[PDB]
RNA sequence: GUGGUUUAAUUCGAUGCAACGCGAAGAACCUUACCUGGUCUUGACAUCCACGGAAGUUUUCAGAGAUGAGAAUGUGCCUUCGGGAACCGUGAGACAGGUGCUGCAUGGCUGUCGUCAGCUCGUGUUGUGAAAUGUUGGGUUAAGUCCCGCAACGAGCGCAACCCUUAUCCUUUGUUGCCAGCGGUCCGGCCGGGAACUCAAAGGAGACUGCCAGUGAUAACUGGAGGAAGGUGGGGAUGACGUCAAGUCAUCAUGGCCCUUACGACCAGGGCUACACACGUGCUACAAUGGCGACUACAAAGAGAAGCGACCUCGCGAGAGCAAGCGGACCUCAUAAAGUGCGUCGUAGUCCGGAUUGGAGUCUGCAACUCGACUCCAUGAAGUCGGAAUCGCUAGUAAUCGUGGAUCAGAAU
């Protein structure tokens, strides 16, 4: 068995990789069940495709906090890093995609003086 | 343009508050108004004494009030007569039985709040400020310190056009939020007009 | 009014002394009065701002 | 086995009281499970800094309600005598 | 909101950018500073003196109110019984007050060109002098950033650095967390139980062009590996010598000037939301990658004492009556919306769009006929996307959707 923390935005998804059929369990619920009708759901298992696993691995996931979208990215990271433990050599190929990198973007307070907290209000054709 | 109040900009760091007491959502207003009303008299009746500061602490129904003066003798009065007068007259302001203290200040030259008064006092009279500042800055510099700076605006020397005398020694980093620079500000009534007196005393980095 | 303010009459009708109510002293409103001052919610405010009410002060935030 | 949760608005007056509660119980009784922070529920306000225009300002404010645990086990007669008698902090609400 | 027009008054200031939801972070009386009419006083506010009753409470008569008249409980307190402290009321004296004018007389604070990037000093040297040199020149940089050269050598304000929030990790700690692990389970962490994980809090660790290749005199630039993040990683506070004689004397303080039966005070009653038009700033629009009904799945940050209001009952509903719990990361505001599953609607001014108007009702408030918001029924317009110009932006950002909060009894699109 192997483990992966995985984090994105405001969500944590522990990934416990285990050799098996290829079914994953998200909070005691099937992958499709939890992520029901959310095209993005697919990206969650992307890291497993690169190194070609899934049909060889069975995963047990535990996610909490944030939203389904964020959880999807969190579980992804957890899977990528978990794959590393199984075989470090996977890094050389799994890293090129950037799956080992955690998206640091965080919904920052929409500061004022600007409309986007970052983006400032320009001026008319002076 | 102005520069962030040195004292107010370093309150989070080396620079305690004038009044420290527990929270109180509904009493915060009254207590403060009381702390301000007590300062009112301590800022006048305690003038001739070099009132550097007036710390304030408040238990349930009490207050300490520690007036730091350069010459506590004038505050205490003849064999301790004035202090009795104060505590009483102050009680009239707020029934709450208040305490009182008279912690002296070792060498006023290090106290900014006082350096300002000494400078304005001479100006109120009528003396070449260029000398006042030059001396004042030298005094605090003489008594030690690592830096000092004095500034007087208004119509210096009774001149028609307003000016701003400078002068300073050592280091007075207002940006270095750590320097712990004791600030001050003393007004100055005059026949020709008002004039502000600002003095900075940098003592130790930490 | 002058007729409703029968409260002024110390001796209540057939009803026991409990009949005696309140009524404001200024406006004479029975709706919302303040026992301590004997004034209604509307008069206590007007009297407050005027400062005619001793010891009373507006709470601040 | 007595747990003492100390909560208050000011962060300092708590460290003072909480520390005292420990030090005093450190002698007569056990060494205490040690004073700890615990989760602090925060209440923040976002009002306009400047009264006019500068709509794009409104600073942030916050009023925190800190907590503590301490928790003193193996209480002796003197272990409590050192508590009931001395009590300074006023902005601190004790819960034994 | 404003101009104009208007009015008994519809207070005043602000005006190209740096006037126009502008001071008013909230005008129903109050606030207001306006108008008609009735009416007063040491007086709405400050200090003090002399003086016969004097603290204080509750009623009556008259009245539109104000006001006037009048009647009844009755003093502790410092000292002996007289004096006497206090506040209070009348009579009398000495006096206050003014958002009334001038911010080109001003302090303070703030806006602006500007976060724009440079601006200067001490001493030396050159010139009769105003000044120059140093801040010029070559390379380089986002930058007087840095390097090299040079009578210049150093220094100050600025830059950078010093603090906080956010991104990865660790240590300390856990009544939040979770069978992650085991046991029980009304299978709700719920319980036992344990701190791993998330989280909470504090401290600490961490990038510095160091390593590799190319170019270069150097600085440095370009590519690359390692790496959670890299070349100031990302967001705050902070705004130089000075400018416009910028704004405010209605925040406050202040020099001069000006009024003190009245440019003071009280009360009753009237407007600012008056229109043939003109302008600025905004809002709501036209669908089926849509609207509607039922069912159903996830959020964060916030608020609550007479207040948030579960639950029950009455009403189509607003709401009303009753009423539990919390004082609150354990009770409530809450339902999150879009989303998902199922069903319904056909291109016509239409189940598009909601103006306007009629009727009924709820709620706040002393009291909503010019001046309310909201609910239900009925009515249901213009509009089928727009003539000349012109405005907003480079990433979780645009665009789009919904939610909580400050001010606050209540017009925030």
From Swiss-Prot, chain A:
GO terms for cellular component: cytoplasm; cytosol; cytosolic small ribosomal subunit. It comes from Escherichia coli (strain K12). This is Small ribosomal subunit protein uS9. Part of the 30S ribosomal subunit. Contacts 16S rRNA. Cross-links to the P site tRNA and weakly to the A site tRNA. One of its GO terms (molecular function) is structural constituent of ribosome. SUPFAM superfamilies: Ribosomal protein S5 domain 2-like. Keywords: Ribonucleoprotein, Ribosomal protein, RNA-binding, tRNA-binding. The lineage of its organism: Bacteria, Pseudomonadati, Pseudomonadota, Gammaproteobacteria, Enterobacterales. The C-terminal tail plays a role in the affinity of the 30S P site for different tRNAs. Mutations that decrease this affinity are suppressed in the 70S ribosome. The keyword RNA-binding applies. PROSITE patterns: RIBOSOMAL_S9. One of its GO terms (biological process) is cytoplasmic translation. Belongs to the universal ribosomal protein uS9 family. It holds the Pfam family Ribosomal_S9.
Curated annotation (Swiss-Prot), chain B:
The keyword Ribonucleoprotein applies. InterPro entries: KH_dom, KH_dom-like_a/b, KH_dom_type_2, KH_sf_prok-type, Ribosomal_S3_C_sf, Ribosomal_uS3_bac-typ, Ribosomal_uS3_C, Ribosomal_uS3_CS. One of its GO terms (biological process) is cytoplasmic translation. It holds the Pfam family KH_2. GO terms for cellular component: cytoplasm; cytosol; cytosolic small ribosomal subunit. Residues 38-106 form the KH type-2 domain. Keywords: Ribonucleoprotein, Ribosomal protein, RNA-binding, rRNA-binding. GO terms for molecular function: mRNA binding; rRNA binding; structural constituent of ribosome. Belongs to the universal ribosomal protein uS3 family. Binds the lower part of the 30S subunit head. Binds mRNA in the 70S ribosome, positioning it for translation. Part of the 30S ribosomal subunit. Forms a tight complex with proteins uS10 and uS14. With proteins uS4 and uS5 encircles the mRNA as it enters the ribosome, which may play a role in mRNA helicase processivity. Some nascent polypeptide chains are able to cross-link to this protein in situ. In collided ribosomes contacts ribosome rescue factor SmrB. This is Small ribosomal subunit protein uS3. It comes from Escherichia coli (strain K12). The gene is rpsC.
UniProtKB/Swiss-Prot annotation, chain C:
Part of the 30S ribosomal subunit. Contacts proteins S3 and S10. Keywords: Ribonucleoprotein, Ribosomal protein. GO terms for cellular component: cytoplasm; cytosolic small ribosomal subunit; small ribosomal subunit. Binds 16S rRNA, required for the assembly of 30S particles and may also be responsible for determining the conformation of the 16S rRNA at the A site. The gene is rpsN. One of its GO terms (biological process) is translation. The chain holds residues 41 to 101 of 101 of the full protein. This is Small ribosomal subunit protein uS14. GO terms for molecular function: rRNA binding; structural constituent of ribosome; tRNA binding. Belongs to the universal ribosomal protein uS14 family.
Swiss-Prot record, chain D:
Belongs to the universal ribosomal protein uS10 family. GO terms for molecular function: structural constituent of ribosome; transcription antitermination factor activity, RNA binding; tRNA binding. Coiled coil: none annotated. Keywords: Ribonucleoprotein, Ribosomal protein, Ribosome biogenesis, RNA-binding, Transcription, Transcription antitermination, Transcription regulation. This is Small ribosomal subunit protein uS10. Involved in the binding of tRNA to the ribosomes. Part of the processive rRNA transcription and antitermination complex (rrnTAC). The complex forms an RNA-chaperone ring around the RNA exit tunnel of RNA polymerase (RNAP). It supports rapid transcription and antitermination of rRNA operons, cotranscriptional rRNA folding, and annealing of distal rRNA regions to allow correct ribosome biogenesis. In complex with NusB is involved in the regulation of ribosomal RNA (rRNA) biosynthesis by transcriptional antitermination. It comes from Escherichia coli (strain K12). One of its GO terms (cellular component) is cytosol. The keyword Cytoplasm does not apply. One of its GO terms (biological process) is cytoplasmic translation. HAMAP family: Ribosomal_uS10. PANTHER family: 30S RIBOSOMAL PROTEIN S10 FAMILY MEMBER (PTHR11700). It comes from the Bacteria.
């Amino acid at each position: 068995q192997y483990y992966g923390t995985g984090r994105r935005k405001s969500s944590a998804a522990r990934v416990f990789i285990k050799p098996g059929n290829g079914k994953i369990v998200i909070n005691q619920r099937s992958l499709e069940q939890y992520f029901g009708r959310e095209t993005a759901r697919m990206v969650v298992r992307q890291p497993l495709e690169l190194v070609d696993m899934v049909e060889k691995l069975d995963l047990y996931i535990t996610v909490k906090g944030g939203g389904i979208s964020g959880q999807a990215g969190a579980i992804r990271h957890g899977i990528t890093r978990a794959l590393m433990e199984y075989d470090e050599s996977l890094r050389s190929e799994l890293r090129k995609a950037g799956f080992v990198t955690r998206d640091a973007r965080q919904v920052e307070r929409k500061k004022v003086g600007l409309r986007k907290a970052r983006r400032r209000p320009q001026f008319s054709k002076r | 343009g102005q520069k962030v109040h040195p004292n107010g900009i370093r309150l989070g760091i080396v620079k305690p508050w004038n009044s420290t007491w527990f929270a109180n959502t509904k009493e915060f207003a009254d207590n403060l108004d009381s702390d301000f009303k007590v300062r009112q008299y301590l800022t006048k009746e305690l003038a001739k004494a070099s009132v550097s500061r007036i710390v304030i602490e408040r238990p349930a129904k009490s207050i300490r009030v520690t007036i730091h003066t350069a010459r506590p003798g004038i505050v205490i009065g003849k064999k301790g007569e004035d202090v009795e007068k104060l505590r009483k007259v102050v009680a009239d302001i707020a029934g709450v039985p208040a305490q009182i203290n008279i912690a002296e200040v070792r060498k006023p030259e290090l106290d900014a709040k006082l350096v300002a008064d000494s400078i304005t006092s001479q100006l109120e009279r009528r003396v070449m400020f260029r000398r006042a500042m030059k001396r004042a800055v030298q005094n605090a510099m003489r008594l030690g310190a690592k830096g000092i700076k004095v500034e007087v605006s208004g119509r210096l020397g009774g001149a028609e056009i307003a000016r701003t005398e400078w002068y300073r020694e050592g280091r007075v980093p207002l940006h270095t939020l750590r320097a712990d620079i004791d600030y001050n500000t003393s007004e100055a009534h005059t026949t020709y007009g008002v004039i502000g007196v600002k003095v900075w005393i940098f003592k130790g980095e930490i | 009014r002058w007729n409703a303010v029968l409260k002024l009459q110390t001796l209540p009708r057939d009803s026991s002394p409990s009949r005696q109510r309140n009524r404001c002293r200024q406006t004479g409103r029975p709706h919302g009065f303040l026992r301590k001052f004997g004034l209604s919610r509307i008069k206590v405010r007007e009297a407050a701002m005027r400062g005619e009410i001793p010891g009373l002060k507006k709470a601040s935030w | 086995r007595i747990r003492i949760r100390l909560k208050a608005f000011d962060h300092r007056l708590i460290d003072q009281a909480t520390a005292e509660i420990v030090e005093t119980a450190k002698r007569t009784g056990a060494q205490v499970r040690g004073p700890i922070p615990l989760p602090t529920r925060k209440e923040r306000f976002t009002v306009l800094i400047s009264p006019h225009v500068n709509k794009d300002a409104r600073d942030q404010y916050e009023i925190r309600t800190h907590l503590r645990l301490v928790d003193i086990v193996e209480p002796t007669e003197k272990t409590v005598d050192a508590l009931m008698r001395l009590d300074l902090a006023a902005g601190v609400d004790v819960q034994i």
